[PDB]
What we know:
By secondary structure, the chain is mainly β. It has one helix at residues 19-23, and strands at residues 3-6, 9-13, 25-29, 34-38, 54-59, 64-69, 74-78, 87-96, 107-110, 113-120, 125-130.
Amino acid sequence: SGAIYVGNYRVVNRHLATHNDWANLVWEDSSRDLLVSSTTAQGCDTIARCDCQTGVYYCSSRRKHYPVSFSKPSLIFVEASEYYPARYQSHLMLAVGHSEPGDCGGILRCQHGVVGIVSTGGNGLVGFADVRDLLWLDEE
Length: 140
Ligand SMILES: CN(C)Cc1ccc(C#N)cc1
Ligand SMILES: [Zn+2]
């Protein structure tokens, strides 16, 4: 579990969005596994605006942050998980690391701020849904 709290936005994995998220919906994309809802209180996170390929992510199933190198966001085939079938996911970055279903929502961060959230796992990789292209998160 986990979210990004930027401005008056909450960014969550679409597959973990709540009824309140859907009732306060800003934007969602199944192909990216992302959903954004509106919040009453402003949040503490800053979104990275960069093309870094190195950062640190939080792994809840290890209670640990790990430094990783990761691929640039792309359209990638993802094998079946507990929460999605085997399918293509867009805007997905991969690193070598540990990721189980409940790790979804852990933050990946670089020197510029939040890069994305854990979205995929298995076979010794962790996949992250990028948010650096969502420039509208920084205003309004
Ligand atoms: C449970 N396994 C059969 C894979 C899977 C997991 C979740 C969903 C959804 N929705 C679809 C398929
Ligand atoms: Zn960066």
